Design a protein around this ligand. Structure first.
Ligand SMILES: Cn1c2c(c(=S)n(C)c1=O)N[C@H](SCCN1CCOCC1)N2
Length: 498
């Protein structure tokens, strides 16, 4: 069989499982950058306030259009002068970006941009790029002060805060990131923003990886779509930091339901479910540089995710980022060296009452294990349980209104995670958050069978979260602490219980 466990049709999903949203409203913990009183299906949202207001300080994004962005001269004026020239050759665009980035004229390589334009694209495609797409991108970038009129707070460490903005606002901000206009975000030895991801796209232009043309095709598909026809919806970005975590050894909650399959994907088959992003602590990972596995791919086919890098501080152990409403603009095949842009995607997701696409993604970063056995240390197991639990828990929401979790081999691959341990950690964390699990093994049919078999074994014997966590602790003591191990985890568990 291609899938085991509970039928996926029986799992909860949005919008059907959600409660009616309250009235969207700004508050101390919710920044809203549009006119809620004018929000209407199929209309471009109106920015609030009407006229640009600037904050240039330690708690907000430093906007390129700020009067305090100086070089004294006005850097915004220089950006306007640089970008409003006709581009007919890729050197023109390199020279323009470097006019307001003089300090990086040696450090920043543009080989991938030059090669995309001159050596990948056919003549007609290149003409469309520089006669239509790039000029349209410049115009939406330079509209920033009329589009993003309200200061954007940083989602700093330990903040429990949300930002809701329009897709159109995000497009203006991402156009600025493409043209590398965000100040104070470039220096290798920067301090103010050293704990924040890169936002400017300059590393997307460097080098000769065969992957860069596919990244650029994916992003220009998005740019071509959102400059041609303004998107009308909203997107919410929520930083969540929990202080009260389970006493896992004492948790008497039962396990929840499981659907596990080695076919399908989170983004296609997990529609309306809580979709896990296998994140870097710096959200988005290498999306704007080198990096093209699960997180980067999702950030490329849903580019509105990328703007989280503008304002999201590196995630601490007890934190996650929840993004609701991003739209899928691209389809793809493969991953890493085999990733290819396929075609434009027409997102058919419903929108909720805040005009957000019914797509919820949570970025949770797994640990990186130098040594395989390190991940069975109890402190490290607890850390991953608590990270997933934070990602899955929705304070204030009842379990019947919680979609299933759509996830997979989180932190396995480059990070060195063991898939069978990580599957059980997510199953336990979901159980504690009272959500069902939809698990994609991405071609690994044996893993599907193994996860299913363990899950049904444990549920039929009515073992609790705490019962299972204590078995993980026994495995650490017996096979790992004084030890790769002589016996694998699931065999150990079956033997210990039987
Ligand atoms: C869309 N998608 C997806 C993956 C997974 S696992 N899942 C569940 C998914 O839905 N992997 C790939 S990218 C790197 C490949 N690695 C192989 C499996 O270990 C994790 C990552 N893309």
């Amino acid at each position: 069989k291609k899938w085991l466990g509970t039928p996926i049709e029986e799992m909860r999903r949005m919008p059907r499982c959600g409660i009616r949203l309250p009235l969207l409203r700004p508050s101390a913990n919710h920044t809203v950058t549009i006119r809620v009183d004018l929000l209407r299906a199929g209309e471009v949202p109106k920015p609030f306030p009407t006229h640009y207001k600037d904050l240039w300080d330690n708690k907000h994004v430093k906007m390129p259009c700020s009067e305090q962005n100086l070089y004294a001269g006005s850097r915004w004026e220089l950006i306007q002068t640089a970008l409003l020239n006709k581009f007919t050759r890729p050197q023109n665009l390199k020279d323009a970006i470097l006019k307001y980035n003089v300090a990086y004229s040696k450090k920043w390589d543009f080989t991938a941009l030059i090669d995309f334009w001159d050596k990948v694209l056919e003549e007609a495609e290149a003409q469309h790029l520089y006669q239509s797409i790039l000029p349209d991108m410049v115009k939406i970038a330079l509209c920033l002060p009329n589009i993003c009129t309200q200061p954007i707070p940083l989602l700093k460490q330990k903040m429990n805060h949300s930002i809701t903005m329009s897709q159109e606002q995000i497009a203006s901000l991402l156009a600025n990131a493409f043209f590398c206009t965000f100040p104070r975000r470039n220096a290798k030895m920067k301090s103010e923003y050293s704990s924040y991801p890169d936002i400017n796209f300059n590393r997307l232009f460097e080098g000769r990886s065969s992957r860069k043309p596919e990244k650029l095709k994916t992003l220009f598909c998005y740019f071509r779509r959102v400059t041609e026809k303004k998107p009308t919806g909203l997107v919410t970005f929520t930083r969540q930091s929990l202080e009260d975590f389970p006493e896992w050894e004492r948790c008497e909650k039962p396990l929840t339901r499981l659907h596990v399959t080695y076919e399908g994907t989170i983004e296609e088959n997990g529609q309306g479910m809580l979709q896990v992003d296998f994140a870097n602590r710096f959200v988005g990972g290498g999306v704007t540089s080198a990096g093209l596995v699960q997180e980067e791919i999702r950030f490329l086919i849903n580019p509105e995710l990328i703007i989280s890098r503008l304002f999201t501080e590196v995630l601490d152990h007890n934190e996650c980022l929840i993004i609701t409403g991003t739209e899928q603009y691209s389809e793809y095949t493969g991953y890493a060296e085999t990733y290819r842009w396929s075609r434009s995607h027409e997102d058919g997701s419903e929108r909720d009452d805040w005009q957000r696409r019914c797509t919820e993604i949570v970025a949770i970063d797994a640990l990186h294990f130098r040594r395989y056995l390190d991940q069975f240390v109890p402190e490290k197991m607890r850390r991953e349980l608590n990270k997933a639990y934070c990602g899955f828990l929705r304070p204030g929401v009842s379990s019947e209104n919680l979609s299933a979790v759509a996830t997979g081999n989180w932190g396995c691959g480059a990070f060195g995670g063991d898939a069978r341990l990580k599957a059980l950690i997510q199953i336990l964390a979901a159980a504690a958050a009272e959500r069902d699990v939809v698990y994609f093994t991405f071609g690994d049919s044996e893993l599907m069978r193994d996860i299913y078999s363990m899950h049904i074994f444990l549920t039929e014997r009515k073992l609790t979260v705490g019962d299972v966590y204590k078995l993980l602790l026994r495995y650490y003591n017996e096979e790992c602490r004084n030890c790769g191990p002589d016996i694998k985890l699931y065999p150990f568990i079956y033997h210990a219980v039987e």
